[PDB]
Structure 1
Amino acid sequence: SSSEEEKKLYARLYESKLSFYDLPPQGEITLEQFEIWAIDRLKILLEIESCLSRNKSIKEIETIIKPQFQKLLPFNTESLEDRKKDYYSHFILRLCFCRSKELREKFVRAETFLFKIRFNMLTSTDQTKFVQSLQFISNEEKAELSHQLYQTVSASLQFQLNLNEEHQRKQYFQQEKFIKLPFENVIELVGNRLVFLKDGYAYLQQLNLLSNEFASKLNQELIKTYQYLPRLNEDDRLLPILNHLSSGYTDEINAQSVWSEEISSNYPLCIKNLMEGLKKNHHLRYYGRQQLSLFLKGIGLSADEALKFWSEAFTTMEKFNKEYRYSFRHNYGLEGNRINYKPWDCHTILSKPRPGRGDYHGCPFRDWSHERLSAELRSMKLTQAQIISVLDSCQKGEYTIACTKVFEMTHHIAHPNLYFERSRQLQK
């Protein structure tokens, strides 16, 4: 499309500053802006999810995503570059997260949160302007049903528009419109008596309806995007991109427990071999110690139970307090610059120098032989063709796919902690 056709298209599609993002895009983009825009939108999503995980309230979320709006993704600024930026970034995200149901759920939730924040951000005129372009009840039906709608919506106006004064509520209720829909679509608002109902028709708290409609349409579109994934999978320019963006979003367990089958049943091969070495030799070398320590932190072992277990495995205390206690406490960030060092991933663990005699660290899909790997897989009750598949994955330099392979057959993962997490989630 010529720049005029695309100009008119985005004028029509972004007549309102907000849209449910209904149709596929129209144009071409150089890969650099592809990455910049995807990263901006993903980072803003990550920050919003960080805000919600700690249960921050609405206005503080607005305030904290305001600067990332002002820096990363401009809003309410008429620059057509801003508009196409946002649109393309969103649909790239739809490409990204459509791969798994957990990821689809999180993406739909988070993009609907974006919808929410953008909506409360906008002006009244432009709010209703988006809402216009699902039937608005007539002004006559409004006047006839005036007292009931006033009674219903007065409390919501008080709590949501800080309209403590009654006169302001009357003035805005005069300005407010009302929509008519069967209550089977707003039963959530019905339960709390947030919307008036009449003869099986709900008068809508309209923002919640708009947001959940958007969310459901988003989920359907995202499932469809996953369905059509193989027809883009020939795009060798985007599969690294989509994998990178997908990975971009990534006591019961006690010192005595980590030796129990209920706890080590979920381990990957690396951690199993590290446990085996720690049990056998009653000592590991620096790399195995660090890998295992940060892993056991990632699964959730307490610092005191960590000291307990590590001290137990060495069947003197003097040398411990002399040399190992400080290092172990430094590992948990409880020393020095106070850096709770995030666990090594399969990538960082592979980035470590290769293991030798007395070493057990690394990715055993690399550091072992096909003989030992295959014997261990047979011990895991795997079939023959499964063994050929795992070894074929290994031989191609692809250790992580072999790991996720053995996972799916004993029950994309490049993190032992998320390996354990998914394994436990399957039991929960």
Structure 2
Amino acid sequence: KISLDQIDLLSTKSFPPCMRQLHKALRENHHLRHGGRMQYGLFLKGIGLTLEQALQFWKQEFIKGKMDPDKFDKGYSYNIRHSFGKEGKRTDYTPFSCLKIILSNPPSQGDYHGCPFRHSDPELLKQKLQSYKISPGGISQILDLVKGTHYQVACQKYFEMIHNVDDCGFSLNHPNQFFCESQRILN
């Protein structure tokens, strides 16, 4: 279903800011750390991508990093296949829940994964939202919620005033759920 020519548009329109930042980092640096790689692979599996297209996209992006295909094949192809439950125990995996991304495995230096509303600094988040044509009132509300230790409802309000809807109508527990709810209204 999903092709390679609309993933960028989907990230800019439907993806939450965390995975949008991960996609931008993968596009620019042509590389990612283990946390970002795992999160992006699980999300791409969740949205509906199969093994062939995911492998094609990953190898094409790695070519943009300028390492030989053999290196990628013997280094990370096994990990990608195991992420889909196609090797080892052959156990299918669930994409990381929003609660785990917010709390579990916090990012470190050089890591772009995790919740920006909890990990990314507010001062850089201001220009990040400016790049996302976010209204100043929404930015102030998001900052106030962040100062109030509110992350799930903060992303809920973010989805609300980026989706031109007053009420989202769901409880935020999964970025895959976020994308599905965004697509249910957009499409």
In structure 1, what residue type is equivalent to 2:150? E
- Equivalent residue number for residue 304 of structure 1: 52
2-structure distance, mates of 1:375, 1:356: 21
1-structure distance, mates of 2:5, 2:134: 29
Q: Is the 8 A contact 1:380 1:410 kept in 2?
A: no
**Secondary structure at the residue paired with 1:367?**
coil
Indicate the percent of aligned positions where both proteins have the same amino acid.
41
- Equivalent residue number for residue 100 of structure 2: 348
Runs (5+) with no aligned partner, structure 2: 164-170
Which structure ranks higher in relative contact order (CA pairs < 8 Å, sequence separation ≥ 6)?
2
Q: Is the 8 A contact 2:107 2:114 kept in 1?
A: yes
**Aligned-pair distance for 1:309?**
0.5
Structure 1 runs (4+) deviating above 3 angstroms are none
Q: Is the 8 A contact 2:11 2:23 kept in 1?
A: no
In structure 1, what residue type is equivalent to 2:126? S
The TM-score with structure 2 as length reference comes to 0.87
Runs (5+) with no aligned partner, structure 1: 1-250
2-structure distance, mates of 1:320, 1:373: 33
Q: Is the 8 A contact 1:374 1:387 kept in 2?
A: yes
Is 1:407 the counterpart of 2:166? The answer is no
Q: Is the 8 A contact 1:298 1:343 kept in 2?
A: yes
**Aligned-pair distance for 1:347?**
1.0
1-structure distance, mates of 2:27, 2:184: 27
**Secondary structure at the residue paired with 2:58?**
helix
Residue from 177, 183, 186 that aligns with 1:424: 183
In structure 2, what residue type is equivalent to 1:386? G
Q: Is the 8 A contact 2:101 2:114 kept in 1?
A: yes
| Structure ID, larger Rg | 1
- Equivalent residue number for residue 363 of structure 1: 115
Superposition pairs for residues 158-307 of structure 1, below 5 Å?
251=1, 253-259=2-8, 261-262=9-10, 264-307=12-55
Superposition pairs for residues 4-403 of structure 1, below 5 Å?
251=1, 253-259=2-8, 261-262=9-10, 264-314=12-62, 315=64, 316-403=68-155
Q: How many residues get paired?
A: 176
**Aligned-pair distance for 1:422?**
1.2
**Secondary structure at the residue paired with 2:76?**
helix
